[PDB]
């Protein structure tokens, strides 16, 4: 049941690499302190997402065996997972415990941030459903690595090479799930099930961004090639 020394080494390596991200406190404190216009909030998201993509590329290239992959499959994996990794990270941040009434204010601030009503509902249903999993930082880190190293992404030339890389991470996560939550033996299945919901956000993402109640939808050149926006 317990982790092998290789798995323990793998877990800690993924964990350190994952912690190079912007602190959940830095994001929440920024939007909780002041109420912003849709224009300022669009600009906050665009800055947040550019930093996120940058740190995501660095996290991804530290994933074991990632640098041994074909360079075209490398791009495909990063483009394929970037939106999902972003919503999983927002879901992580959203569900961090804050003082009384703070999580309620954060939610109300995202709700009136500037996004269309139609996208708020599936986004908050996904966040609340991730919270019901009571995920550890380790679980968030591994699931992000699993999302990145998805062999069933579009335009992947060598699925098997990606499969061989994702399999040790799935093994670790499963060992963790059966350790922390023996009470819920279906916890691992529930985690993998959320991944199929993340995929839906990817499909309607460009529409989500253009639907923001701003006059100009200006993105950074990096977000432009990652999100396929103009």
């Amino acid at each position: 049941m317990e982790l092998t020394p290789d798995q323990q080494t793998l877990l800690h390596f993924i964990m350190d690499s994952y912690n190079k991200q912007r602190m959940p406190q830095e994001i929440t404190n920024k939007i909780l302190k002041e109420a912003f216009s849709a224009e300022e909030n669009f600009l906050i998201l665009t800055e947040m997402a550019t930093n996120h993509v940058q740190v995501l590329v660095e996290f991804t290239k530290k994933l074991p065996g990632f640098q041994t992959l074909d360079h075209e499959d490398q791009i495909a994996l990063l483009k394929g997972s970037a939106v999902e990794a972003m919503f999983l990270r927002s879901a992580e941040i959203f569900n961090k415990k804050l003082p009384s009434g703070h999580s309620d204010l954060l939610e109300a601030r995202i709700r009136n941030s500037g996004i269309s009503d139609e996208y708020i509902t599936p986004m908050f249903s996904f966040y609340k459903s991730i919270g019901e999993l009571k995920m550890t930082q380790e679980e968030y880190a591994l699931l992000t690595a699993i999302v990145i190293l998805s062999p069933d992404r579009q335009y992947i030339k060598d699925r098997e090479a990606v499969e061989k890389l994702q399999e040790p991470l799935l093994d670790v996560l499963q060992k963790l799930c059966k350790i922390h939550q023996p009470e819920n033996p279906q916890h691992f299945a529930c985690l993998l099930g959320r991944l199929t919901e993340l995929r839906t956000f990817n499909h309607h993402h460009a529409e989500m961004l253009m639907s923001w109640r701003v006059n100009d939808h200006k993105f950074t050149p990096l977000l432009c090639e990652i999100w396929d926006v103009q």
Binding site: Q54, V57, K61, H71, Q74, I75, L78, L222, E225, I226
Partner: peptide, 11 residues
């Protein structure tokens, strides 16, 4: 094409 992502990956 995606030269920014390519640049970040190849550094």
């Amino acid at each position: 094409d995606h030269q920014l992502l390519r640049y970040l990956l190849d550094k």
